Amino acid sequence: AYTTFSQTKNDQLKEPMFFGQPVNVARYDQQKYDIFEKLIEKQLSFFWRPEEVDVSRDRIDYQALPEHEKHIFISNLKYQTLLDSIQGRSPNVALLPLISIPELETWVETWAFSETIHSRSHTHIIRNIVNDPSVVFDDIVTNEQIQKRAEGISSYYDELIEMTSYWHLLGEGTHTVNGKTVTVSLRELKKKLYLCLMSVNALEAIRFYVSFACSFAFAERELMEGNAKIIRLIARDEALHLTGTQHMLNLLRSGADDPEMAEIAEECKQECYDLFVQAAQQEKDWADYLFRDGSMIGLNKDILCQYVEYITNIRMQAVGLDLPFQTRSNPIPWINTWLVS
Amino acid sequence: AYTTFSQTKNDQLKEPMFFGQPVNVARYDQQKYDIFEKLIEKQLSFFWRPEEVDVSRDRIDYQALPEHEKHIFISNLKYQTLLDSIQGRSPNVALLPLISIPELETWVETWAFSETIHSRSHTHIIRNIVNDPSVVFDDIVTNEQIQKRAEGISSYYDELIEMTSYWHLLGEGTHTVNGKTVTVSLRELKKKLYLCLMSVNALEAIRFYVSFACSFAFAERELMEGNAKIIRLIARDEALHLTGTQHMLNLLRSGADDPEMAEIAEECKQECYDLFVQAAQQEKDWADYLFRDGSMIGLNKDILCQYVEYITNIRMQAVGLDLPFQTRSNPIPWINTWLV
Ligand SMILES: [Hg+2]
Ligand SMILES: [Hg+2]
Ligand SMILES: [Hg+2]
Ligand SMILES: [Hg+2]
Ligand SMILES: [Hg+2]
Ligand SMILES: [Hg+2]
Ligand SMILES: [Hg+2]
Ligand SMILES: [Hg+2]
Ligand SMILES: [Hg+2]
Ligand SMILES: [Hg+2]
Ligand SMILES: [Hg+2]
Ligand SMILES: [Hg+2]
Ligand SMILES: [Hg+2]
């Protein structure tokens, strides 16, 4: 039931963002939602190559860092590397099969592409600061504290993908497979998509943002400046990515795109609220682990805890959720220097 | 059983290209096959923005073409628009879920991205040479002769995706699904992927080169120069794309990757041959439609037929297949100018 070229002539301006007729012709002269075309144009305008950033002094900077600061630096970078590894592939494997307007289709492929550039940039840094990159790369997979902080990201995508496959193969209904009942409901699949996109919003809008504070705290001391330049370019992309998910989510909950989806979103208001708080809690928990045997000029576990609360309130507000934390001004206004957006 | 972040610490240098553990960490410091890393670098080096291309003279040129030349030009562009629509999405939906080495995964995503840029360039031209783009785009979907020429492309991808979903959901074996016996064979799925790759090779290496020749026949008349600029950029990318599939296919044939894929390539040899012979015939058949209202000096059914045979023999040789066609020299050596 999925096809790479639906042979039915359809009005692409009238399809929903998701679950409609798969996109046939790729055209960009018109859109149902011009935000997605504007994001494509902007991301293309921002194209960069990691190899064109001078990183030659980052190795000696890193080596001269006190052992606990090396630990803060490398652990933060390993988590960034985990997140971009996942985001390189997942928007394509998880969202593309479900998209039914051309502007959003191409936005997702362009988004995913920009993520692979991010992963390439993380290799560029690692190669240039450690003798054996394999040690860093292997620790990403098995590192207990990172299985923990991002515990649950791959599962949301994975369940969405599995349910999408059942939907595409069998359609809605009550089915049997090898002696067991398998229920496929479009409503449940819409719910999974909604929560997946909420989680992707928290990933890019908060999890990655909190990581920028660690990277740019070294930059403020004129250390790891090659890395800083790369993270700066990544943050400029991230601003677009979270703008895309913000719009998808707001168009889904308003009811202008799919009334069923607006019901679903109201229905999981509490669940979503609680998912946001958990992501924030996970990032707080990591902060402590980062800072377990020392702190830095400009950063420590309580400052980065406050930043997690600050950023979380802003993002939740932006997608129409209640604020879990005490309202405060930015605890690290110096970071605005680096977040050019 | 697909996962976006596989949990086992595996040696990515020892996975197969396809069907191994899904890639976890995306790293570019090492490769099983450096050709794919070299292709990513080159394609990134070629980044272009379609809208920056000046096509302001193409509307003048186009509107002044005789009607039969408008037909030739726009039928060709509509077919290019079809193939890049499919290619923008298909490598990511059909291949990406089966890749087990990071360099191949990222190449497939870069390749696909580059195809969405091709599609964006077709919009750029179309919107600047006609007053209603929708008539052009709508016709791509319903045009009986366009779809006849493309028959089998989306069908092949679609079949591979369905079979892949069954494999990820149920695993190998014989299953009972809504009372029907469904066999999931990894060997059969490997054959499907393998022949999909062969078909993609024919698509980029033959079907698109035939279309380039029709595009450049106008450039040779000093017409449609914005478009020719765009097609030259497209062709530069296409050369990388076909290099990628040639190397995937030839590495599989070698036995140096998955040994079962090497058995499959040999076993399915005739199927490989047949699919190239059918694609070539479809490209020939398109001539009657293309030249329906008349042909052009140096571009007609005979010339097109000759070029199809010429290029098909070259691509077939490059992946170890016998040649179906009589050997010939290039019937349109003027195209070399445009193909750098
Ligand atoms: Hg998602
Ligand atoms: Hg998700
Ligand atoms: Hg941090
Ligand atoms: Hg819900
Ligand atoms: Hg919700
Ligand atoms: Hg909600
Ligand atoms: Hg949420
Ligand atoms: Hg906190
Ligand atoms: Hg706090
Ligand atoms: Hg294919
Ligand atoms: Hg031609
Ligand atoms: Hg073959
Ligand atoms: Hg011929």
Swiss-Prot record, chain B:
Its EC number is 1.17.4.1. One of its GO terms (cellular component) is cytoplasm. Binds 2 iron ions per subunit. Pfam families: Ribonuc_red_sm. InterPro entries: Ferritin-like_SF (IPR009078), RNR-like (IPR012348), RNR_small (IPR033909), RNR_small_AS (IPR030475), RNR_small_fam (IPR000358). It is an enzyme of class 1 (oxidoreductase). Coiled coil: none annotated. Induction: Induced 4.2-fold by hydroxyurea (at protein level). Fe cation 1 binds at D84, E115, H118. It catalyses: a 2'-deoxyribonucleoside 5'-diphosphate + [thioredoxin]-disulfide + H2O = a ribonucleoside 5'-diphosphate + [thioredoxin]-dithiol. The keyword Flavoprotein does not apply. Its cofactor is Fe cation. GO terms for molecular function: identical protein binding; iron ion binding; ribonucleoside-diphosphate reductase activity, thioredoxin disulfide as acceptor. The keyword Transmembrane does not apply. Fe cation 2 binds at E115, E204, E238, H241. GO terms for biological process: 2'-deoxyribonucleotide biosynthetic process; deoxyribonucleotide biosynthetic process; nucleobase-containing small molecule interconversion; ribonucleoside diphosphate metabolic process. The active site is at H122. NCBIfam families: PRK09101.1. PANTHER family: RIBONUCLEOSIDE-DIPHOSPHATE REDUCTASE SMALL CHAIN, RIBONUCLEOSIDE-DIPHOSPHATE REDUCTASE SUBUNIT M2. Belongs to the ribonucleoside diphosphate reductase small chain family. Provides the precursors necessary for DNA synthesis. Catalyzes the biosynthesis of deoxyribonucleotides from the corresponding ribonucleotides. R2 contains the tyrosyl radical required for catalysis. Tetramer of two alpha (R1) and two beta (R2) subunits. The B1 protein is a dimer of alpha subunits. This is Ribonucleoside-diphosphate reductase 1 subunit beta. The lineage of its organism: Bacteria, Pseudomonadati, Pseudomonadota, Gammaproteobacteria, Enterobacterales.
